[PDB]
């Protein structure tokens, strides 16, 4: 009995890859089909060895190795659309490695993943990762507030939003966390009781003055 | 039978290593499988001697030996990502050890861990450990107050934090403590209530809180 017959009837939602360490890798697509395959190897109807990988946790398995041997590295995510050639999205304006010591990292990333053949390295730009998050946040017409600092930015969504302003903001972030991850940019959706959605002003003798962004907000009596 | 069949059906979560003191060490990953493996050696279905090691428990045993024979040593953590060649993160800006007295430490540390083949000692910087922690604390948008002194800094978080800040704070400290450890930088979360809820007050240099229309409070500078 081969491997792709002991799984379900639909033989296209999974993807069996041959390993290099004499193992066999099955490529699921979500956490629901992961427990479908892990029940097979746990009930024990397969003779040889087999492992289960996943997008959200193999990006965690080689980030635990990565923040020990290569600290202060700026990267976003590893995409696994074709598992024989992964793509590593580095930062261009924050990484200072030459061509000789970037080829050592690709051969060292090869030893962590015995199913992969060659890891592809490209240098993604750093302001494009902030422009898509800003122009995508103005497109939904959401009252936000940007805080620029060194080595990552952050966007705060304060205020008493209603159900449509929560549903549009929550839906855009999860379609953005899939692409770039949460290493650089972090979203800060929070509900407080102020009808003024985030902003704050002080008033004297000339009009209103826009205050510097702080954590304290005035609670609204209306 | 041999040990790798006496464990569970999933032959992937444990990895047995033969020791130098005529033992066989198994390297688990959390406390849920160490009690699984220690149940095996306790019920007694194995003739020889064996042990179950861990990342954090072995990181406290070889720190008790180190503060007896080598006190006033500045280090952070020993990383156990590959259990046959561990990496020791020593500090740079706080010790004056030469190359000749680093080989005595790297050869006397091998005899305490019989499973390892060699220890790779690297000298980490001291400002990047606190520069990634301060910059990591602004990204979560938390109010704080850094107090610097000689041989360690600390960050104190105060205020009426809401429920999203006490979940982003636990997900950040446990990701930083997992890498560097709690030897150099320590956080102190303490939460108090707001004295200013329905009260009117003046802020700035001469700050005071009006607890009632006829009651003033002059706080500490």
């Amino acid at each position: 009995a081969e491997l792709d017959s002991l799984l379900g009837q639909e033989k296209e939602r999974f993807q069996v890859l041959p390993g290099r360490d004499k193992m066999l890798y099955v490529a699921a697509q979500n956490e629901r089909d992961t427990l479908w395959a892990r029940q097979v190897l746990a009930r024990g109807d397969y003779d040889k060895n087999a492992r289960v990988i996943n997008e959200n946790e193999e990006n965690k398995r080689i980030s635990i190795w990565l923040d020990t041997y290569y600290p202060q590295l700026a990267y976003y995510r590893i995409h696994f659309d074709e598992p024989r050639k992964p793509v590593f999205w580095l930062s261009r304006q924050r990484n200072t490695m030459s061509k000789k010591e970037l080829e050592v990292l690709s051969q060292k990333l090869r030893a962590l993943m015995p199913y992969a053949d060659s890891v592809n390295i490209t240098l993604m730009d750093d302001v494009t990762a902030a422009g898509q998050a800003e122009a995508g946040l103005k497109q939904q017409a959401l009252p936000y507030s940007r805080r620029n600092h060194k080595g990552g930015v952050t966007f705060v969504i304060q205020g008493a939003l209603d159900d449509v302003e929560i549903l549009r903001a929550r839906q855009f972030v999860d379609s953005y966390y899939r692409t770039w991850g949460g290493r650089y940019v972090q979203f800060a959706i929070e509900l407080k009781d102020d009808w003024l959605k985030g902003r704050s002003f002080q008033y004297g003798a000339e009009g209103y003055i826009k205050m510097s962004p702080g954590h304290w907000y005035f609670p609204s009596p209306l | 039978a041999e040990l790798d069949s006496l464990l569970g059906q999933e032959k992937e979560r444990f990895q047995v290593l033969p020791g130098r003191d005529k033992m066989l060490y198994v390297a688990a990953q959390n406390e849920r499988d160490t009690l699984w493996a220690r149940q095996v050696l306790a019920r007694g279905d194995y003739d020889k001697n064996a042990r179950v090691i861990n990342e954090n428990e072995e990181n406290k045993r070889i720190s008790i030996w180190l503060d007896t024979y080598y006190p006033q040593l500045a280090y952070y953590r020993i990383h156990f990502d590959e259990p046959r060649k561990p990496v020791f993160w020593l500090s740079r800006q706080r010790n004056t050890m030469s190359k000749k007295e680093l080989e005595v430490l790297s050869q006397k540390l091998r005899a305490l861990m019989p499973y390892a083949d060699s220890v790779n000692i690297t000298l980490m910087d001291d400002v990047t450990a606190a520069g990634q922690a301060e910059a990591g604390l602004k990204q979560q948008a938390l109010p704080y107050s850094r107090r610097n002194h000689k041989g360690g800094v600390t960050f104190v978080i105060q205020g009426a934090l809401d429920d999203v800040e006490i979940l982003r704070a636990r997900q950040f400290v446990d990701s930083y403590y997992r890498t560097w450890g709690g030897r150099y930088v320590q956080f102190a979360i303490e939460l108090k209530d707001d004295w200013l809820k329905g009260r009117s007050f003046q802020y700035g240099a001469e700050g005071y809180i009006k607890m009632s229309p006829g009651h003033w409070y002059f706080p500490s500078p």
């Binding site: 002080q202 | 108090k192 009117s200 007050f201 802020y203 240099a205």
Partner: peptide, 26 residues
């Protein structure tokens, strides 16, 4: 434990006597 950065007077439903007495130093 008074989290604000600048200088100023915050008034929550004052009765125009404790408000204008606070402006009696400027």
């Amino acid at each position: 434990k008074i989290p604000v950065t600048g200088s100023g007077f915050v008034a929550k439903d004052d009765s125009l006597r404790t408000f204008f007495d606070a402006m009696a130093l400027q």
